[PDB]
Design a protein around this ligand. Structure first.
Ligand code: DJK
Length: 248
């Protein structure tokens, strides 16, 4: 056992929403938390503001992982839900920048997420977004870089790829990438060089970011550190004449 380990008595489960389940709850009475009921010492060596913070772990089984509590649920739900209607390009390019920031931190540490996509970003108060679900994590395929889906070549550079697919989620309010295409149509057509076209109302400039992120060449894709800065500066350096549209 290590120092992350706790006893269950300190854990007060409360509300189920919603591989294994996820509850809201309480830790040592004073502390509102979240529990994932189902090894993973990566959630232990990663600590950053835009990654969902581990608090404690439990095992022997039935195993409990204890995270920081994220009030608004997952980004996928949040984008398709009531909020979606009102999210506009500056909220979204910001959420992007927060995710890039967390990923830029993952980058610095020589880690790989491997399952980066909207369903794995949790949202909080004030539109805070934080990377979560290091599921698959070391040292499905519509979001997966081709070399990864094909040859198991997972790197920070295939995460950049997913990031770009996430970018399309973000700007279509949560729609499934490659609409009307099934997995084998996507794998096949991406091998031919196909890429998602500019989303409706999305600037050409941000779709280029998307295109840079989907370069066939794992190493010609950019860094998260670059993605972060370009998304932070977006409205001054890249699109300073931005004006609201009906959707974005
Ligand atoms: C987008 C679907 C999804 O994953 N759902 C989801 C909804 C709400 C929610 N609230 C709080 N926490 C989580 N997930 C979670 C992920 C990692 C660790 C922990 Br403790 C919780 C969700 C997930």
């Amino acid at each position: 056992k290590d120092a992350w380990e706790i006893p269950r008595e300190s854990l007060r489960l409360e509300v189920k929403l919603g591989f294994g389940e996820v509850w809201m709850g309480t830790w040592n009475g004073t502390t509102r938390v979240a529990i994932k009921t189902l090894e993973a010492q990566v959630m232990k060596k990663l600590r950053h503001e835009k990654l969902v913070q581990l608090y404690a772990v439990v095992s022997e089984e039935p195993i409990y992982i204890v995270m920081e509590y994220m009030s608004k649920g997952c980004l996928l739900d949040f984008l398709k839900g009531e909020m979606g209607k009102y999210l506009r390009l500056p909220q979204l390019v910001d959420m992007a920048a927060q995710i890039a920031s967390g990923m830029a931190y993952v980058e610095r540490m020589n880690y790989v997420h491997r399952d980066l996509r909207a369903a794995n970003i949790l949202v909080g108060e004030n539109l805070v977004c934080k990377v979560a679900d290091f599921g698959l994590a070391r040292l499905p395929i519509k979001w997966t870089a081709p070399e990864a889906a094909l040859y198991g070549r997972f790197t920070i550079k295939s995460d950049v790829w997913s990031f770009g697919i996430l970018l399309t989620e973000l700007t279509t309010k949560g729609r499934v990438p490659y609409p009307g295409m099934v997995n084998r149509e996507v794998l096949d057509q991406v091998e031919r060089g196909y890429r998602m076209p500019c989303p409706p109302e999305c600037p050409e400039s941000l779709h280029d970011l998307m295109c840079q992120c989907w370069r066939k060449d794992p190493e010609e894709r950019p860094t998260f550190e670059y993605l972060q800065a370009f998304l932070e500066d977006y409205f001054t350096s890249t699109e300073p004449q931005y004006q609201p549209g009906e959707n974005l």
